[PDB]
């Protein structure tokens, strides 16, 4: 029954409904142009109707709003079922008071089930080390005293998505102890977990020169990057341990995003009734890591979700579903692997 506080599940708060938000945000979504496609593509959009949503799967909870109190209660109950102690919240620097309100709603709901919340800092517009520092300060100031705000050994933790978009010479200003705008040894110090993507020849000096406290791999699709190739995890962990870094590999139950990225079929990983998830989670446990991240709770666009899904067919699309498993199988199977992780941690 114990929640695991070193298990981080990537959570997305960007869904809307007509009733609450005035539109089906994110269930409606632009279709992405082919990066190798022509010059003047008109890929179109997915309208977020009942029949047609921007996922290859279909949520048991329907086209829900992330601000709906009833949905938040259910999501937190699902985290309890999964034994996942930390919700890693996507964060886009929206700046509007309604972002703040929603963050406040998630924190309050989480705390009722003793779930903790940390922030997943996304590549928001014009993100750089100066406004990153500004934002880290604001988040710690605004939410640091909330009982659900995550700390590891007294420290906040931030995952930094696509951290490679900012060079190490920039990162060092923020993350070196001698950095010109350093957070080290200040009230705003935190564990900063950057994204390990490619080969060790590039990633090792990146992580060292950028002064990240750790790294994660994010991608649910095996082999999409060097970092998301689980046979690499034992050597990645040995390097991390040698260099005083926290390795948080990311595990997922599958991947498919061809509703929003029709050209991206090569990245599909079928779930094969839970077999894919089992193989991946087992690999993370075997690498002897001290923490695990799960991609994802509810990234519906990318079909990596462990949130319950239902069989559904419409005139628009035949949705995938969990096959010979119940809608809540990925939640309970996550609990199973969390228990195994705890036993040998």
Ligand X SMILES: OC[C@H]1CNC[C@@H](O[C@H]2O[C@H](CO)[C@@H](O)[C@H](O)[C@H]2O)[C@@H]1O
Q: How far apart, in whole angstroms, are the C-alpha atoms of residue 119 and residue 99? A: 13
Shortest gap between Cβ of 317 and ligand X (angstroms)?
17
Site string for ligand X, 82-111 (x = CB under 6 A): --------x---------------------
Shortest gap between Cβ of 184 and ligand X (angstroms)?
25
Told to check if 120 binds ligand X by CB under 6 A, we report yes
Q: How far apart, in whole angstroms, are the C-alpha atoms of residue 79 and residue 88? A: 12
Q: How far apart, in whole angstroms, are the C-alpha atoms of residue 23 and residue 29? A: 11
List residues bridging with 4 in a β-sheet. 84
- Taking the least distance from each CB to ligand X, the nearer of 67 and 250 is 250
Piece in contact with ligand X (CB under 6 A), picked from 67-75, 182-190, 279-287, 295-303: 295-303
The residue from 302, 306, 320, 337 that contacts ligand X (CB under 6 A) is 302
> β-pairing, 28-30 with 45-47?
antiparallel
Please, where are the H alpha helices in the chain? 18-21, 69-82, 97-112, 129-143, 168-175, 200-210, 233-242, 275-286, 329-344
3-state SS, residue 343? helix
Shortest gap between Cβ of 59 and ligand X (angstroms)?
15
Find the residue with minimal CB distance to ligand X: 301
The residue from 75, 152, 283, 301 that contacts ligand X (CB under 6 A) is 301
Shortest gap between Cβ of 257 and ligand X (angstroms)?
6
Residue 169's closest CA among 206, 194, 122? 206
> What DSSP designation does 118 have?
E
Site string for ligand X, 158-187 (x = CB under 6 A): ---x--------------------------
Main-chain dihedrals φ then ψ at residue 215, nearest 5 degrees: -150, 155
Shortest gap between Cβ of 7 and ligand X (angstroms)?
17
Piece in contact with ligand X (CB under 6 A), picked from 100-108, 220-228, 237-245, 294-302: 294-302
Q: How far apart, in whole angstroms, are the C-alpha atoms of residue 104 and residue 148? A: 10
Contacts of 15 (CB under 8 A, 6+ apart): 25, 26, 27, 63, 64, 65, 66, 298, 300
- Taking the least distance from each CB to ligand X, the nearer of 26 and 333 is 26
Piece in contact with ligand X (CB under 6 A), picked from 1-9, 103-111, 242-250, 296-304: 296-304
Site string for ligand X, 247-286 (x = CB under 6 A): -------------x--------------------------
Cα maximum dimension of the chain: 60
- Taking the least distance from each CB to ligand X, the nearer of 280 and 285 is 280
Shortest gap between Cβ of 238 and ligand X (angstroms)?
27
3-state SS, residue 255? strand
Shortest gap between Cβ of 118 and ligand X (angstroms)?
13
* Interface ranges with ligand X (CB under 6 A): 90, 120, 122, 161, 260, 299, 301-302
């Amino acid at each position: 029954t114990e929640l695991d506080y070193d298990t981080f599940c990537f959570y997305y708060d960007w869904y809307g409904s007509e009733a609450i938000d005035g539109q089906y945000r994110h269930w409606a979504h632009a279709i992405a142009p082919d990066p190798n496609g022509g010059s003047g593509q008109n890929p179109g959009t997915i309208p977020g109707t009942q029949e047609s949503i921007a996922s290859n799967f279909y949520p048991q909870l329907g086209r829900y709003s992330s601000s709906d109190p009833n949905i938040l209660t259910k999501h937190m109950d699902m985290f309890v079922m999964a034994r996942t102690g930390v919700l890693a919240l996507t964060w886009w620097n929206e700046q509007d008071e309604t972002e703040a309100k929603r963050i406040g709603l998630i924190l309050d709901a989480a705390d009722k089930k003793k779930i903790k919340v940390c922030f997943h800092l996304e590549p928001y517009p014009s993100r750089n080390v100066q406004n990153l520092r500004e934002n880290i300060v604001k988040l710690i100031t605004r939410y640091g005293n909330h009982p659900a705000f995550y700390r590891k050994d007294g420290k906040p933790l931030f995952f930094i998505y696509d951290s490679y978009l900012i060079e190490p010479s920039e990162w060092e200003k923020l993350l070196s102890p001698g950095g010109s705008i350093t957070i080290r040894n200040t009230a705003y110090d935190a564990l900063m977990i950057g994204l390990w993507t490619s080969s060790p020849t590039v990633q090792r000096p990146f992580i060292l020169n950028a002064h990240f406290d750790g790294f994660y791999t994010y991608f649910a699709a095996t082999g999409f990057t060097y970092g998301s190739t689980p046979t690499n995890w034992v050597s990645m962990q040995k390097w991390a341990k040698e260099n005083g870094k926290i390795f948080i590999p990311s595990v997922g139950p599958g991947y498919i995003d061809t509703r929003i990225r029709p050209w991206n079929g090569s990245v599909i990983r079928t779930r094969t009734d839970g077999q894919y998830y089992d193989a991946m989670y087992r690999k993370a446990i075997e690498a002897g890591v001290s923490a695990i991240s799960i991609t994802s709770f509810n990234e519906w666009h990318e079909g990596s979700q462990i949130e319950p899904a239902v069989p559904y067919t419409s005139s628009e699309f035949t949705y995938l579903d969990y096959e010979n498993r119940e809608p809540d199988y990925y939640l309970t199977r996550t609990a199973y692997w969390v228990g195994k992780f705890r036993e040998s941690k």
